[PDB]
Amino acid sequence: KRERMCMKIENDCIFEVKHEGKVTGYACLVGDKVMKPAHVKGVIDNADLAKLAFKKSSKYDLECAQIPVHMRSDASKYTHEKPEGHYNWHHGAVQYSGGRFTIPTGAGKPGDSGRPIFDNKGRVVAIVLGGANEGSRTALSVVTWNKDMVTRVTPEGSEEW
Amino acid sequence: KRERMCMKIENDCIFEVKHEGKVTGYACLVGDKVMKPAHVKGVIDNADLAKLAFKKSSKYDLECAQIPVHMRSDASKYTHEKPEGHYNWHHGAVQYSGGRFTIPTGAGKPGDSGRPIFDNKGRVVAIVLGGANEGSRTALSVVTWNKDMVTRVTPEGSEEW
Amino acid sequence: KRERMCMKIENDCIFEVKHEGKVTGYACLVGDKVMKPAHVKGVIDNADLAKLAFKKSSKYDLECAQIPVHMRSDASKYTHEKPEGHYNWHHGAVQYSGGRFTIPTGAGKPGDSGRPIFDNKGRVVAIVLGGANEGSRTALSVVTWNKDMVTRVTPEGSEEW
Amino acid sequence: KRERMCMKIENDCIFEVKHEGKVTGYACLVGDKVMKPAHVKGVIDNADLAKLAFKKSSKYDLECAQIPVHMRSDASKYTHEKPEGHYNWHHGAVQYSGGRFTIPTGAGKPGDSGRPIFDNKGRVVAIVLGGANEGSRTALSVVTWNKDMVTRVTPEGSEEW
Amino acid sequence: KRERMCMKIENDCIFEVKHEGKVTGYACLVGDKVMKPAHVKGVIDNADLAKLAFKKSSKYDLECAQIPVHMRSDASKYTHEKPEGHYNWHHGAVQYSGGRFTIPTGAGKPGDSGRPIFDNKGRVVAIVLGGANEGSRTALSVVTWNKDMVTRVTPEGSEEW
Amino acid sequence: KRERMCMKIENDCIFEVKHEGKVTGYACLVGDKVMKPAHVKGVIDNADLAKLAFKKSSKYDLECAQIPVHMRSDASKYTHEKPEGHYNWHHGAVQYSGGRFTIPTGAGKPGDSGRPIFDNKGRVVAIVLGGANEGSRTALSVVTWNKDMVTRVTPEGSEEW
Amino acid sequence: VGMSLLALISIFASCYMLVAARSKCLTPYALTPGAAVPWTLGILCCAPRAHA
The answer to whether D20 contacts chain F (CB < 8 Å) is: yes
Alpha carbons within 13 A on the beta-carbon side of E34? 27
Alpha carbons within 13 A on the beta-carbon side of B60? 24
The 8 Å CB, 24+ separation contacts for B53-58 are B55/G27, B55/G30, B55/G31, B56/G27, B57/B150, B57/G27, B57/G28, B57/G31
Beta strands in chain E (DSSP E): 14-19, 22-30, 33-36, 43-44, 55-57, 62-66, 85-89, 92-97, 100-103, 116-118, 124-134, 137-145, 150-153, 159-160
**Testing the interface with F: which of D18, D20, D24, D43 to mutate, by most F Cβ within 10 A?**
D20
Q: Residue E138's beta-bridge partner residues? A: E103, E133
The answer to whether F47 contacts chain D (CB < 8 Å) is: yes
Verify whether residue A113 is a known catalytic residue: yes
**Rg of chain E on CA atoms, in Å:** 15
DSSP helix, strand, coil percent of chain E (3-state; round to 5): 15, 45, 40
Distance CA D55, CA D63 (A): 5
Closest-CA distance of chain E to residue D71, Å: 6
| Alpha helices (H) along chain C | 2-13, 47-50
Could you tell me which residues come within 8 angstroms of residue C78 by beta carbon, excluding any fewer than 6 positions away?
C30, C31, C123, C124, C145
**What amino acid is encoded at C60 in this protein?**
Y
Residue B91: other Cβ atoms inside 10 A: 15
Taking contacts as CB-CB distances below 8 angstroms, the residues of chain E near D73 are: 134-137
Distance CA F67, CA F81 (A): 24
Neighbours of chain G (3+ CB pairs under 8 A): B
**Testing the interface with D: which of E101, E134, E141, E159 to mutate, by most D Cβ within 10 A?**
E134
Taking contacts as CB-CB distances below 8 angstroms, the residues of chain D near F46 are: 21
Asked if B32 and G33 come within 8 Å (Cβ–Cβ), the reply is: yes
Closest-CA distance of chain B to residue C88, Å: 21
Distance CA E109, CA E159 (A): 11
Closest-CA distance of chain B to residue D52, Å: 14
Taking contacts as CB-CB distances below 8 angstroms, the residues of chain B near G29 are: 148
* Residue whose C-alpha is closest to residue B155's, from B125, B117, B128: B128
Method for this entry: cryo-EM
Contact of chains A and B by CB distance (3 or more pairs under 8 angstroms): yes
Closest-CA distance of chain B to residue C73, Å: 41
Distance CA B151, CA B60 (A): 7
CA distances from A16 to A10, A38, A45, E18, G35 (A): 11, 14, 6, 21, 56
Distance CA E85, CA E152 (A): 20
**What amino acid is encoded at A144 in this protein?**
T
* Residue whose C-alpha is closest to residue F15's, from F86, F76, F78, F58: F76
Asked if C135 and B72 come within 8 Å (Cβ–Cβ), the reply is: yes
Q: Which of B32, B60, B147 sits opposite G31 (nearest CB)?
A: B60
Distance CA E28, CA E127 (A): 9
Could you tell me which residues come within 8 angstroms of residue A41 by beta carbon, excluding any fewer than 6 positions away?
A19, A24
Neighbours of chain E (3+ CB pairs under 8 A): A, D
Could you tell me which residues come within 8 angstroms of residue D141 by beta carbon, excluding any fewer than 6 positions away?
D129, D130, D131, D132, D152, D153, D154, D155, D158
* Residue whose C-alpha is closest to residue A103's, from A27, A26, A20, A161: A161
Closest-CA distance of chain B to residue A71, Å: 6
| Alpha helices (H) along E36-95 | 47-50
Taking contacts as CB-CB distances below 8 angstroms, the residues of chain D near F50 are: 21
Point out the catalytic residue in the list F61, F112, F119, F141. F61
The 8 Å CB, 24+ separation contacts for F149-152 are F150/F60, F150/F62, F152/F59, F152/F60, F152/F61
Distance CA C149, CA D41 (A): 75
**Residue C97: DSSP 8-state:** E
Distance CA B137, CA B142 (A): 15
**Testing the interface with B: which of C100, C105, C134, C159 to mutate, by most B Cβ within 10 A?**
C134
Using DSSP, state whether A46 is helix, strand or coil. coil
CA distances from F76 to A138, D75, F69, F112 (A): 106, 46, 15, 19
Backbone φ and ψ of C80, nearest 5°: -135, 0
Could you tell me which residues come within 8 angstroms of residue A22 by beta carbon, excluding any fewer than 6 positions away?
none
The answer to whether D99 contacts chain F (CB < 8 Å) is: no
Taking contacts as CB-CB distances below 8 angstroms, the residues of chain D near E136 are: 73
| Alpha helices (H) along chain D | 2-12, 47-50
**Residue E54: DSSP 8-state:** P
DSSP helix, strand, coil percent of chain F (3-state; round to 5): 10, 45, 40
Distance CA A82, CA A141 (A): 16
Taking contacts as CB-CB distances below 8 angstroms, the residues of chain E near D71 are: 135
* Residue whose C-alpha is closest to residue B116's, from B106, B124, B108: B124
Distance CA D39, CA D42 (A): 10
Asked if E135 and D77 come within 8 Å (Cβ–Cβ), the reply is: no
Torsion (CA) B2, B6, B8, B14 in degrees, nearest 10: 180
The answer to whether C84 contacts chain B (CB < 8 Å) is: no
**Testing the interface with B: which of A46, A70, A72 to mutate, by most B Cβ within 10 A?**
A72
Distance CA F139, CA F131 (A): 6
CA distances from G51 to C92, E7, E89, G34, G48 (A): 29, 73, 67, 12, 6
Contact of chains B and G by CB distance (3 or more pairs under 8 angstroms): yes
Distance CA F30, CA B51 (A): 40
Verify whether residue B113 is a known catalytic residue: yes
Distance CA F133, CA F131 (A): 7
Contact criterion met (CB below 8 Å) for B29 and B67? yes
Residue B156 host element (H or E): none
**Quick one: three-class SS letters along C41-76?**
CCEECCHHHHCCCCECCCCCCEEEEECCHHHHHHCC
Contact criterion met (CB below 8 Å) for E5 and E11? no
Asked if A51 and E22 come within 8 Å (Cβ–Cβ), the reply is: no
Verify whether residue F136 is a known catalytic residue: no
* Residue whose C-alpha is closest to residue B42's, from B34, B51, B50: B50
Taking contacts as CB-CB distances below 8 angstroms, the residues of chain F near D20 are: 47, 51
Residue C134 host element (H or E): strand C123-134
Distance CA F124, CA F34 (A): 13
Alpha carbons within 13 A on the beta-carbon side of E84? 8
Distance CA E69, CA E72 (A): 6
The answer to whether C99 contacts chain B (CB < 8 Å) is: no
**DSSP per position, B48-86:** HHHSSPPEEETTTTEEEEEPPGGGGGGS--B-----SEE
Asked if D72 and E136 come within 8 Å (Cβ–Cβ), the reply is: no
Taking only residues 132 to 161 of chain B, the set having a beta carbon closer than 8 angstroms to any beta carbon of chain A reads 132-137, 139, 156-157
Distance CA C33, CA F92 (A): 54
Using DSSP, state whether F155 is helix, strand or coil. coil
Taking contacts as CB-CB distances below 8 angstroms, the residues of chain F near D19 are: none
Contact criterion met (CB below 8 Å) for F61 and F130? no
Distance CA G48, CA F85 (A): 61
Distance CA B73, CA B79 (A): 17
Q: Residue F66's beta-bridge partner residues? A: F33
Contact criterion met (CB below 8 Å) for G33 and B78? yes
Residue A87: other Cβ atoms inside 10 A: 17
Using DSSP, state whether D51 is helix, strand or coil. coil
Closest-CA distance of chain B to residue G35, Å: 8
Residue F76: other Cβ atoms inside 10 A: 20
Q: Residue G13's beta-bridge partner residues? A: none
Contact criterion met (CB below 8 Å) for D157 and D132? yes
* C-alpha torsion sign, points D155, D156, D157, D161: positive
The angle at the Cα of B111, spanning B110 to B117, to the nearest 5 degrees, equals: 100
**DSSP per position, G1-52:** -HHHHHHHHHHHHHHHHHHHHHHHHHSGGGSSS----HHHHHHS--S-SS--
Point out the catalytic residue in the list B45, B48, B57, B61. B61
Point out the catalytic residue in the list B113, B119, B141, B158. B113
Residue A153: other Cβ atoms inside 10 A: 16
* Residue whose C-alpha is closest to residue A128's, from A57, A37, A41: A37
Contact criterion met (CB below 8 Å) for D82 and D96? yes
Q: Which residue of G has its CA nearest to B54?
A: G30
* C-alpha torsion sign, points A122, A123, A124, A125: negative
Alpha carbon distance, N-terminus to C-terminus of chain G = 46
Asked if C133 and B69 come within 8 Å (Cβ–Cβ), the reply is: yes
Using DSSP, state whether D23 is helix, strand or coil. strand
CA distances from D94 to A108, D84, D90, D128, D153 (A): 88, 11, 10, 11, 16
Q: Which residue of D has its CA nearest to E137?
A: D73
The answer to whether D41 contacts chain E (CB < 8 Å) is: no
**What amino acid is encoded at D88 in this protein?**
N
Closest-CA distance of chain A to residue E107, Å: 21
Closest-CA distance of chain C to residue B74, Å: 8
Distance of CA F6 to the CA centre of its chain: 13
Contact criterion met (CB below 8 Å) for A17 and A24? yes
Residue A161 host element (H or E): none
The angle at the Cα of D125, spanning D123 to D131, to the nearest 5 degrees, equals: 135
Torsion (CA) F82, F84, F86, F91 in degrees, nearest 10: 50
Backbone φ and ψ of C45, nearest 5°: -75, 65
Distance CA F115, CA F16 (A): 10
Residue A5 host element (H or E): helix A2-13
* Residue whose C-alpha is closest to residue D42's, from D18, D76, D21, D64: D18
Could you tell me which residues come within 8 angstroms of residue D158 by beta carbon, excluding any fewer than 6 positions away?
D129, D130, D131, D132, D139, D141
Q: Given phi > 0 = left and psi -120 to 50 = alpha, else beta, which region is E45?
A: beta
Using DSSP, state whether B15 is helix, strand or coil. strand
CA distances from A33 to A28, A42, A54, G13 (A): 9, 19, 10, 48
Q: Which of B31, B72, B77 sits opposite C134 (nearest CB)?
A: B72
Contact criterion met (CB below 8 Å) for E135 and D70? yes
**What amino acid is encoded at B8 in this protein?**
K
Using DSSP, state whether F96 is helix, strand or coil. strand
Distance CA C17, CA C111 (A): 10
CA distances from D133 to D92, D95, D106, D137, D161 (A): 17, 15, 7, 6, 13
Could you tell me which residues come within 8 angstroms of residue C96 by beta carbon, excluding any fewer than 6 positions away?
C82, C83, C84, C85, C86, C87, C102
Header resolution in angstroms: 3.7
* Residue whose C-alpha is closest to residue C50's, from C32, C38, C68: C68
Taking contacts as CB-CB distances below 8 angstroms, the residues of chain B near C157 are: 69
Using DSSP, state whether A49 is helix, strand or coil. helix
**What amino acid is encoded at F148 in this protein?**
D
Distance CA B52, CA A152 (A): 61
Distance CA D36, CA D57 (A): 11
The answer to whether A38 contacts chain B (CB < 8 Å) is: no
The length of chain D is 161
Distance of CA A85 to the CA centre of its chain: 19
* C-alpha torsion sign, points C93, C97, C100, C102: negative
Could you tell me which residues come within 8 angstroms of residue G10 by beta carbon, excluding any fewer than 6 positions away?
none
Residue F125 host element (H or E): strand F124-134
The answer to whether D54 contacts chain E (CB < 8 Å) is: no
Q: How many beta-carbon pairs under 8 angstroms link D with E?
A: 21
* Residue whose C-alpha is closest to residue D29's, from D60, D89, D90, D73: D73
Q: Beta strand pairing status for C123-134 and C77-78?
A: parallel
Distance CA D111, CA D88 (A): 19
Distance CA E152, CA E100 (A): 11
Contact criterion met (CB below 8 Å) for D75 and D69? no
Using DSSP, state whether F71 is helix, strand or coil. helix
Contact criterion met (CB below 8 Å) for A87 and A118? yes
CA distances from D26 to D14, D20, D40, G43 (A): 6, 15, 9, 66
